[PDB]
Swiss-Prot record, chain B:
Disulfide bonds: none annotated. It is found in: Cytoplasm; Nucleus. Signal peptide: none annotated. The gene is COPS2. Essential component of the COP9 signalosome complex (CSN), a complex involved in various cellular and developmental processes. The CSN complex is an essential regulator of the ubiquitin (Ubl) conjugation pathway by mediating the deneddylation of the cullin subunits of SCF-type E3 ligase complexes, leading to decrease the Ubl ligase activity of SCF-type complexes such as SCF, CSA or DDB2. The complex is also involved in phosphorylation of p53/TP53, c-jun/JUN, IkappaBalpha/NFKBIA, ITPK1 and IRF8/ICSBP, possibly via its association with CK2 and PKD kinases. Belongs to the CSN2 family. It comes from Homo sapiens (Human). This is COP9 signalosome complex subunit 2. Component of the CSN complex, composed of COPS1/GPS1, COPS2, COPS3, COPS4, COPS5, COPS6, COPS7 (COPS7A or COPS7B), COPS8 and COPS9 isoform 1. In the complex, it probably interacts directly with COPS1, COPS4, COPS5, COPS6 and COPS7 (COPS7A or COPS7B). Specifically interacts with the ligand binding domain of the thyroid receptor (TR). Does not require the presence of thyroid hormone for its interaction. Interacts with CUL1 and CUL2. Interacts with IRF8/ICSBP1 and with nuclear receptors NR2F1 and NR0B1. Interacts with NIF3L1. Phosphorylated by CK2 and PKD kinases.
UniProtKB/Swiss-Prot annotation, chain C:
Component of multiple Cul2-RING (CRL2) E3 ubiquitin-protein ligase complexes consisting of CUL2, Elongin BC (ELOB and ELOC), RBX1 and a variable substrate-specific adapter; this complex is also known as ECS (Elongin BC-CUL2/5-SOCS-box protein) complex and may consist of CUL2 or CUL5. Component of a ECS(VHL) or CBC(VHL) complex containing CUL2, RBX1, ELOB, ELOC and VHL. Component of the ECS(MED8) complex with the probable substrate recognition component MED8. (Microbial infection) Interacts with human respiratory syncytial virus (HRSV) protein NS1. The gene is CUL2. Belongs to the cullin family. The lineage of its organism: Eukaryota, Metazoa, Chordata, Craniata, Vertebrata. This is Cullin-2. The chain holds residues 1 to 327 of 745 of the full protein. The Cullin neddylation domain restrains the RING domain of RBX1 in the E3 ubiquitin-protein ligase complex; this restraint is removed upon neddylation of the cullin.
UniProtKB/Swiss-Prot annotation, chain D:
The keyword Cell division does not apply. It comes from the Eukaryota. InterPro entries: CSN1_C (IPR048624), PCI_dom (IPR000717), Rpn7/CSN1 (IPR019585), Rpn7_N (IPR045135), WH_DNA-bd_sf (IPR036390). GO terms for biological process: JNK cascade; protein deneddylation; protein neddylation; regulation of protein neddylation. PROSITE patterns: PCI (PS50250). Keywords: Cytoplasm, Nucleus, Phosphoprotein, Signalosome. Pfam families: CSN1_C (PF21151), PCI (PF01399), RPN7 (PF10602). Disulfide bonds: none annotated. The modification Phosphoserine is found at residue 432. This is COP9 signalosome complex subunit 1.
Swiss-Prot record, chain E:
Ubiquitinated by the DCX(AMBRA1) complex, leading to its degradation by the proteasome. Pfam families: Skp1_POZ (PF03931). One of its GO terms (molecular function) is transcription corepressor binding. The lineage of its organism: Eukaryota, Metazoa, Chordata, Craniata, Vertebrata. PANTHER family: ELONGIN-C (PTHR20648). The keyword Transcription regulation applies. One of its GO terms (biological process) is ubiquitin-dependent protein catabolic process. It comes from Homo sapiens (Human). This is Elongin-C.
């Protein structure tokens, strides 16, 4: 799994032609050590590859890989502002707001332009994470129509729509830690779903996707919220650890060859 | 009046020693069971069981809705799993420091 | 004149700047009206013209200073049997003259060439009669570098030989003369500058080397002659007053940087190798009741290192054998 | 709310200057019953050392409490100060007399300061700096008071001169809201005298020096919302100073340190800090209402310990600095008592907890919602039986999944670092901007 | 009115207590001796010139500094000496745009 | 606390330190030791107004916010040319030169 200028252009073809099937064998495995011999890469290809690759994991319901892809395009240092760096920080907030409730901090080796120029220019995205911590669907709807002019000029339409449904799913998972068997009528007041009939339809979508495990008790008009009865004692879990450890022993062997090469060349 | 102010603490220390010699054999002992053997009312039993557990002397949990003292003999581990959480937090902050030295 | 860069030339300033410097060196008084105008002329000259004039003023004064120090050294060489009294007047007139020149040239040192001799270590420059160039340094430090070339000339065997003679004279008393003896000792300490290592190499060879040799040979022939002539009562009282006057003489002549070094060599010749004679007579002193004879053995043994526990073991066995005899 | 029962003699004789006037005006503006006595005692302080800034602000509140018929003070004052006592009124010939008399005292002290400097006496200059610093405080010159105390630092020669000088800068830094400068000055005043002289002030001690340095720092740490650092230093002070001429009263240090440690420490830490230490026992013995709180918290008596907390809340609200801290410290003590009570339990009943806290079933359900998100416990509310159950995950589920998620990010960040270092080898730097 | 004053006190001194500064437009700036120790060029004149440190004839001749530049220099010396060895509020110094460019050249010359 | 004043008289300023509310007669004694002139011949003025010996500086208008060390206040000086006052008006400072237009 190597990287080059050809691999960066392959991700651009998947953006125009909406078909993420060929982009699966070339993105499911992490890549390292680019192919270099006479010069075939540039700084613009390293920022356009991570920006185009993050959009594939976003639509594929793969938020675990989308957060890592969008983080590499921000940590790259620069001297001024650019269109790629601006769209990378705006999408970093919308992705982190779906998984957790607050935006993750930036590393120490990040660029200073993001925290001095991109941060004040992205005032419409920074205020969105402040209201998300309060968990209020009435106040979140007022920010969509207010910042509608900013989401259209920055071609960010569709990414903010996933955060609207994420607040309703977060309130259901929040009641699982506090409450246990809440009534169907009481669940339509905190989450605000207008009627108990709309509450039974929203909880059924999380069962098919696998975000939470619950059981609807129609005999009493309530709903139960239990945890996952998995002690991780199946023999299939041991094979996942052995398969994941095969990539750790290979990454250390590759770093030993690069460390001996630098020691051969004279340094200060 | 000097010894009268300490007559209450001496009576509470005796009830703690008897509860230790009786909770070892009985796994899930009843709450009214220890009150009948001690010949005391149930008003001070609920207040003494809270102070005994918080003082790291009596293990288990008190269940007022069932009058049964829970003592799971085959409960989950807590001596080995408490070290894996600290190793994960230390290795997470260490990876962010070794990667920040190469811009 | 003004703070803005003007067009002040170099020929219209050196004719008046050299007159003020020559009339102020060698401990000479100058008019205050002319000394105040020298500060406004240096600032209006370095910033004038597109080319910086600071690099030319430092090299112009370096040639005149090198030709003035070497010329004054030949005058002192003509006078003989008086080098110990003329070196003090030459050092006192040069220390005050270089202090007023460094105070006036304090702006040129903080602007052009700010580094000193800490990053340089050239043994060829500064030692010997050279009139070519000098290492880049400040004005206050340039006068100290021009003072080391006056001691390497064939004169160190005369000035140092005549200076240590008056210090060795300790039988008469203190003090013959303090303004002359101390005036030459301080010239070897202030002349040391900064280098790449410790500056304790040049000072230890032109002063600390002949002093530790002549002093150790004077007290060795004195204590050895008084021991075979005078008795033990007079030998202890004579070495006590000489060692007490040596520490006082070092406080008014030498520097505090070499206090424990001179007193260590003086005690190595008085009571040191001859410990077999002082310890043998100390056994008869403690056997009786003598307060004056015992006090002379405690002060001499206190200055000598690892000498206090030696007398403790001798006094312990003395009282142990005396108490057993009375029983 | 307010409390009509409050001793105003001790609360006014503890401080002086601007602190005595501000502490008396806050009581009259909050307590309608204690308004006449609060404004009368505050007007008596303006007679000594007259001024012009604090003489027109006190009279503004007296005219709005007697002439206005919207308040209860109308049947007794009758819109006139002639009612029992005769407080100093404000007329035409009074605004000029309060300004000419204050300026005359300033010219006499400033003329004597120039004579003391010419005599080359460092004792007369340091003594005159204390009289000028306290004179500019009541007049209104907040910047002129710091210039007099700063010049007295160069006239010190003993350990008592540094302590008396550092205590004056703290009084000016309080009005300027400079909490960082107070913590930087208490450390210098503790290293010079080596903590209560070098022998402990002879044998018997009447006014301890350590108590003065420990009481001035507690006021700046409490206003900065630092209950953890303020409760760790107030336990070292002992009751040996007999009130204070310009500091906090000895009846308030037990409440300042007793309420701060009650929210940050549990029951085991209280028996070793505020109980085992003999220095804090003298302060708790003066007020028996504060010592019973620690004993009730250790015997698992949360029912009687809560009723005594709200009884003294009306008296603490009448203060000036402790009043804004009744909404941040009270919510932490109630939250800490609920966590320690649920530790031995695991299946508490809602019907038994509602009758113990003097509440109802409707108020008990709302308290459990704010106890899971804010607290550190893990309880489950079962609405089918109104019993607070408990449903926790396995220990191997939250450990194997957390370590696996960290291992995936460890390999992703390590492989991404090689991509950044790969372009740095073939001479390819940043060329995007 | 009230208050005891001192006849021979305060900052009263002879000719050696105050120094003289000659400007370029004919102005005479007479300030204290302790206030002129902040700079380096003025302090070097009092230590010299010269074997006479004190002679009741101390003066400073500045042919490059006029009157409006030395007016703020004398005020800067009092502001620097008074606002030291203490811990009080330090207000901002009013600096004009036309003077800031001239004060920078005078600060490098006076070594302050 | 302390205030600084300048005594200007015909392009000749005199820097003298005094207290905030000190007597006017004490300020004239300091100038005697520096000018070798009797204090009865000097006359202190404040904005073209004759002062009194019985008054003080704090009663006229010499406060801490006015006679700041960073910006002192002008104090008039008048000698005795015959029997009345001598000087009364002074001369202001010079104007700044032309600024370099290449920097702007």
């Amino acid at each position: 799994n190597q990287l080059t200028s050809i691999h960066a252009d392959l991700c651009q073809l998947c953006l125009l032609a909406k078909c993420f099937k060929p982009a699966l064998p070339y993105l499911d495995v992490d890549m390292m050590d680019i192919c270099k011999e006479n010069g075939a890469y540039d700084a613009k290809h390293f920022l356009c590859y991570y920006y185009y690759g993050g959009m594939i994991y976003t639509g594929l319901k793969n938020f675990e890989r989308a957060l890592y892809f969008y983080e590499q395009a921000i940590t790259t240092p620069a001297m001024a502002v650019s269109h790629i760096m601006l769209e990378s920080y705006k999408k970093y907030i919308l992705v982190s707001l779906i998984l957790l409730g607050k935006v993750q901090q930036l590393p120490k080796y990040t660029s200073q332009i993001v925290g001095r120029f991109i941060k004040p220019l992205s005032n419409a995205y920074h205020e969105l994470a402040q209201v998300y911590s309060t968990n209020n669907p009435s106040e979140l709807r007022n920010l969509v129509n207010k910042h509608s002019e900013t989401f259209t000029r920055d071609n960010n339409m569709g990414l903010v729509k996933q955060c609207l449904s994420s607040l309703y799913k977060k309130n259901i998972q929040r009641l699982t830690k506090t409450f246990l068997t809440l009534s169907l009528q009481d669940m339509a007041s905190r989450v605000q779903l207008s009627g108990p009939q709309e509450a039974e339809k929203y909880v059924l979508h999380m069962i098919e996707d696998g975000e939470i495990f619950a059981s609807i008790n129609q005999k009493d008009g309530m709903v139960s919220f239990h945890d996952n009865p998995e002690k991780y004692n199946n023999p299939a879990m041991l094979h996942n650890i052995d398969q994941e450890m095969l990539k750790c022993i290979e990454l250390d062997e590759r770093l030993k060859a690069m460390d001996q090469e630098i020691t051969v060349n004279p340094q200060f | 009046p000097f010894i009268r102010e300490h007559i209450e603490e001496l009576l509470r220390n005796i009830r703690t020693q008897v509860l230790i010699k009786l909770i070892k054999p009985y796994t899930r002992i009843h709450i009214p069971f220890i009150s009948k053997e001690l010949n005391i009312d149930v008003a001070d039993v609920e207040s003494l069981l809270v102070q005994c557990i918080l003082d790291n002397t009596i293990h288990g949990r008190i269940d007022q809705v069932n009058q049964l003292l829970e003592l799971d003999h085959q409960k989950r581990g807590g001596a080995r799993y408490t070290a894996l959480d600290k190793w994960t937090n230390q290795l997470n902050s260490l990876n962010q420091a070794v990667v920040s030295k190469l811009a | 004149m003004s703070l803005k860069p003007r067009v002040v030339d170099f020929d219209e300033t050196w004719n008046k700047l050299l007159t003020t410097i020559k009339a102020v060196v060698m401990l000479e008084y100058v008019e205050r009206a002319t000394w105040n105008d020298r500060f406004s002329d240096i600032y209006a000259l370095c910033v004038a013209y597109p080319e910086p004039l600071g690099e030319r003023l430092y090299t112009e004064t370096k040639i005149f200073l090198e030709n003035h120090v070497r010329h004054l050294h030949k005058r002192v060489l003509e006078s003989e049997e008086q080098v110990l009294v003329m070196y003090h007047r030459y050092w006192e007139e040069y220390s005050k003259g270089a202090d007023y020149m460094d105070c006036l040239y304090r702006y040129l040192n903080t602007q052009f060439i700010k580094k000193n001799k800490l990053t340089e270590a050239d043994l060829q420059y500064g030692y010997g009669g050279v009139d070519m160039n000098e290492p880049l340094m400040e004005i206050g430090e340039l006068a100290l570098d021009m003072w080391r070339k006056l001691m390497v000339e064939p004169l160190q065997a005369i000035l140092i030989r005549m200076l240590l003679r008056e210090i060795k004279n300790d039988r008469g008393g203190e003090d013959p003369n303090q303004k002359v003896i101390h005036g030459v000792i301080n010239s070897f300490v202030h002349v040391e500058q900064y280098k790449k290592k410790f500056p304790l190499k040049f000072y230890q060879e032109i002063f600390e080397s002949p002093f530790l040799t002549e002093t150790g040979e004077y007290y060795k022939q004195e204590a050895s002659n008084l021991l075979q002539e005078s008795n033990c009562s007079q030998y202890m009282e004579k070495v006590l007053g000489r060692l007490k006057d040596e520490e006082i003489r070092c406080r008014k002549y030498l520097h505090p940087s070499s206090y424990t070094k001179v007193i260590h060599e003086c005690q190595q010749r008085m009571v040191a190798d001859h410990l077999q004679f002082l310890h043998a007579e100390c056994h008869n002193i403690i056997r009786q009741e003598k307060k004056n004879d015992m006090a002379n053995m405690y002060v001499l043994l206190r200055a000598v290192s690892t000498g206090l526990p030696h007398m403790i073991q001798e006094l312990q066995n003395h009282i142990h054998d005396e108490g057993l005899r009375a029983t | 709310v307010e409390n009509p029962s409050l001793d105003l003699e001790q609360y006014a004789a503890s401080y002086s200057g601007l602190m005595r006037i501000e502490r008396l005006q806050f009581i009259a503006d909050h307590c309608p019953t204690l308004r006449v006595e609060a404004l009368k005692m505050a007007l008596s302080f303006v007679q000594r050392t007259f001024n012009v800034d604090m003489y027109e602000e006190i009279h503004r509140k007296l005219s709005e409490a007697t002439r206005s018929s919207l308040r209860e003070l109308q049947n007794a004052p009758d819109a006139i100060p002639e009612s029992g006592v005769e407080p100093p009124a404000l007329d035409t010939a009074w605004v000029e007399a309060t300004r000419k008399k204050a300026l005359l005292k300033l010219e006499k002290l400033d003329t004597d300061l120039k004579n003391y400097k010419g005599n080359s006496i460092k004792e007369s200059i340091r003594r005159g700096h204390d009289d000028l610093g306290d004179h500019y405080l009541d007049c209104g010159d907040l910047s002129n008071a710091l210039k007099c105390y700063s010049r007295a630092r160069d006239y010190c020669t003993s350990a008592k001169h540094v302590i008396n000088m550092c205590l004056n800068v703290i009084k000016v830094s309080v009005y300027l809201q400079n909490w960082s400068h107070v913590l930087s000055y208490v450390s210098k005043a503790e290293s010079t005298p080596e903590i209560a002289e070098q022998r402990g002030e002879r044998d018997s001690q009447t006014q301890a020096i350590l108590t003065k340095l420990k009481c001035a720092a507690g006021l700046a740490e409490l206003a900065a919302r630092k209950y953890k650092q303020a409760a760790k230093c107030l336990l070292l002070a002992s009751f040996d100073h007999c009130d204070f001429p310009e500091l906090l009263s000895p009846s308030n240090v037990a409440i300042y340190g007793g309420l701060c440690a009650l929210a940050t420490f549990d029951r085991q830490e209280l028996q070793r800090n505020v109980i085992s230490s003999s220095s804090f026992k003298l302060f708790l013995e003066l007020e028996p209402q504060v010592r019973d709180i620690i004993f009730k918290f250790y015997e698992s008596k949360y029912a009687s310990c809560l009723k005594m907390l709200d009884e003294m809340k009306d008296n603490l609200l009448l203060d000036m600095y402790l009043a804004p801290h009744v909404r941040t410290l009270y919510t932490q003590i109630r939250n800490r008592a609920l966590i320690q009570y649920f530790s031995p339990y695991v299946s508490a009943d809602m019907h038994r907890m509602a009758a113990a806290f003097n509440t109802t079933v409707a108020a008990l359900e709302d308290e459990l919602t704010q106890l899971i998100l804010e607290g550190l416990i893990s309880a489950r509310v079962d609405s089918h039986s109104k019993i607070l159950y408990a449903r926790d995950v396995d220990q191997r589920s939250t450990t194997f999944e957390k370590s696996l998620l960290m291992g995936k990010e460890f390999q992703r960040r390590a492989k991404a670092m090689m991509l950044r270092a790969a372009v740095l080898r073939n001479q390819i730097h940043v060329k995007s901007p | 009115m009230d208050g005891e004053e001192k006849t021979y006190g305060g900052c009263e001194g002879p000719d050696a207590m105050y120094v003289k500064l000659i400007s370029s437009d004919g102005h005479e700036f007479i300030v204290k001796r302790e206030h002129a120790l902040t700079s380096g060029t003025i302090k070097a004149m009092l230590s010299g010139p010269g074997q006479f440190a004190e002679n009741e004839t101390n003066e400073v001749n500045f042919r490059e500094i006029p009157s409006h530049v030395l007016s703020k220099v004398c005020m800067y010396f009092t502001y620097k000496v008074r606002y030291t060895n203490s811990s009080t509020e330090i207000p901002e110094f009013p600096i004009a745009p036309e003077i800031a460019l001239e004060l920078l050249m005078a600060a490098n010359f006076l070594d302050c | 606390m302390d205030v600084f004043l300048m005594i200007r008289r015909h392009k000749t300023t005199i820097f003298t330190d005094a207290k905030e509310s000190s007597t006017v007669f004490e300020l004239k004694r300091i100038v005697e030791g520096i000018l070798k002139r009797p204090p009865d011949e000097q006359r202190l003025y404040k904005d073209d107004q004759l002062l009194d010996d019985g008054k003080t500086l704090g009663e006229c208008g010499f406060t801490s916010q006015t006679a700041r060390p960073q910006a002192p206040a002008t104090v008039g000086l008048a000698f005795r040319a015959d029997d009345t006052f001598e000087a009364l008006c002074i001369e202001p400072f010079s104007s700044p030169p032309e600024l370099p237009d290449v920097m702007k």
